[PDB]
Amino acid sequence: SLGDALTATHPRVIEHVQAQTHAADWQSTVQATYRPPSDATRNAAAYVNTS
């Protein structure tokens, strides 16, 4: 005999399966704004070095 204290309670209260950001995707704003200028490849349009 056992009660109902053992519940996941995460999917019942707080969850947004479509809008979740995976824990590997976590990053601070400064981390995402100050990239190595030599090999910055996270921007679609940028000034390419043209010799």
């Binding site: 109902d4 204290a5 053992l6 519940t7 309670t9 995460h10 999917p11 019942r12 209260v13 707080i14 969850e15 947004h16 399966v17 479509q18 809008a19 979740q20 950001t21 824990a23 590997a24 976590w26 990053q27 601070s28 704003t29 400064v30 995402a32």
Partner: protein, 426 residues
């Protein structure tokens, strides 16, 4: 670095604290066996605030367990994340209080409060830069309210500089669980107003109808309610644990919410909250979180903010966003319903931002409101106290332990003075 010492008292406090520790452990990516199994390195740099590394990645929570009846400790240990709490932190009596503030505050606390003081001291000097104390307990009960409040007094006496933050559940008109709610509640708040730094009032009926409307659950047992309380509890301290654009610790929010020493009774809510069948409607946008944050139905106290005036407010934002939109929405909500805000203070709302949303979300916001409409709950308590004290019902169980009626007079007069001040500043 800045250290938070968690304290748990009574059945309600023990269960909500177990839920809080489950949520925090999940957020920092440690499995119920005590070892780290996350992926992002952002978690490990700020785990000292809530955990201590013993051996081989065994991170032990910095919590204290306190009660008098074996059932609650048994429930805490039997469930998952039960074998991570330190066995020595289960300081624990055996007789029980049973809905009596005097029993838990003068007799049982007499021979139990010394061991808990030894444990909390040993665990407090264990850390270098202590930030403050965070406690969660009950008020209508005997063990949590009385013994917990006396411990609050003791640790305020010994540590007069470190901050003190409380989550307390309060009596309710329709859902009235026990019979001696007014006697315990009045003395609990009487001590809290003079000793606690800031209090966030909780009640079960607000959680009940939050599960009714927003989540549309059918049978919301204590687990969901404690999970919501834990979500807010973690959202309060998210600044110390993660980098952000504008951090705000407990002192930053307390100086921006407390204009007078006795003006430290807040009310709380959480965003976003939607049903499982409505997961695709809402886009995680600042206006959508803001509109739910300011709604009276999202508040976690039986006090309508529309029946009073906001004095100060605090907003704790998480996740990557833009400050301009948050500030614009804050100004917009301040300007439109300007009749609901105080006049002799500009910029009543304080904001803060962090870049790490809680797990399972995209971005969240936590609201702390120092509204003057919380006096309605106190007047509700006082009228029942005066009516029941009128013919001294159930009094002999209190004066038979050492107490006098003068303590009841002091509690009633002090809380009446507090409601008078709240009405004055409206």
């Amino acid at each position: 670095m800045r250290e938070i010492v968690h304290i748990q008292g009574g059945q309600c406090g023990n269960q909500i604290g177990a839920k809080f520790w489950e949520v925090v452990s999940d957020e920092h990516g440690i499995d119920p066996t005590g070892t780290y199994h996350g992926d992002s390195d952002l978690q490990l740099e700020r785990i000292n605030v809530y955990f201590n590394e013993a051996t081989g990645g065994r991170y032990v929570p910095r919590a204290i367990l306190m009660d008098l009846e074996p059932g609650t400790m048994d429930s805490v240990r039997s469930g998952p994340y039960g074998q991570i709490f330190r066995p020595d932190n289960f300081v624990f009596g055996q007789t029980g209080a049973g809905n009596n503030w005097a029993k838990g505050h003068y007799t049982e606390g007499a021979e139990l409060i010394d061991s808990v003081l030894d444990v909390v001291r040993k665990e407090a000097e264990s850390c270098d830069c202590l930030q403050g104390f965070q406690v969660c307990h009950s008020l209508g009960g005997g063990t949590g309210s009385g013994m917990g409040t006396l411990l609050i007094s003791k640790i305020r006496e010994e540590y007069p500089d470190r901050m003190m933050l409380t989550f307390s559940v309060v009596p309710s008109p329709k859902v009235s669980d026990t019979v001696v709610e007014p006697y315990n509640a009045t003395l609990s708040v009487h001590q809290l107003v003079e000793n606690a730094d800031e209090c966030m009032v909780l009640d079960n009926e607000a959680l009940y109808d939050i599960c009714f409307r927003t989540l549309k659950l059918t049978t919301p047992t204590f687990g969901d309610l404690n999970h919501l309380i834990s979500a807010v509890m973690s959202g309060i301290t998210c600044c110390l644990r993660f980098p952000g654009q504008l951090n705000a610790d407990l002192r930053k929010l307390a100086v921006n919410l407390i204009p007078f020493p006795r003006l430290h009774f807040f009310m709380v809510g959480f965003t976003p909250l939607t049903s499982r069948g409505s997961q695709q409607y809402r886009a995680l946008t600042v206006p959508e979180l803001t509109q739910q944050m300011w709604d009276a139905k999202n508040m976690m106290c039986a006090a309508d903010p529309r029946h009073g005036r906001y004095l100060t407010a605090s907003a704790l934002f998480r996740g990557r966003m833009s400050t301009k939109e948050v500030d614009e929405q804050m100004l917009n909500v301040q300007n439109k319903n300007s009749s609901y805000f105080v006049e002799w203070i500009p910029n009543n709302v304080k904001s803060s931002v962090c870049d790490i949303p809680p797990k399972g979300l995209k971005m969240s916001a936590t609201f702390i409101g120092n509204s003057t409409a919380i006096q309605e709950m106190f007047k509700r308590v006082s009228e029942q106290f005066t009516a029941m004290f009128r013919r001294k019902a159930f009094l002999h169980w209190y004066t038979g332990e050492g107490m006098d009626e003068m303590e009841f007079t002091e509690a009633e007069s002090n809380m009446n003075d507090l409601v008078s001040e709240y009405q004055q500043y409206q």
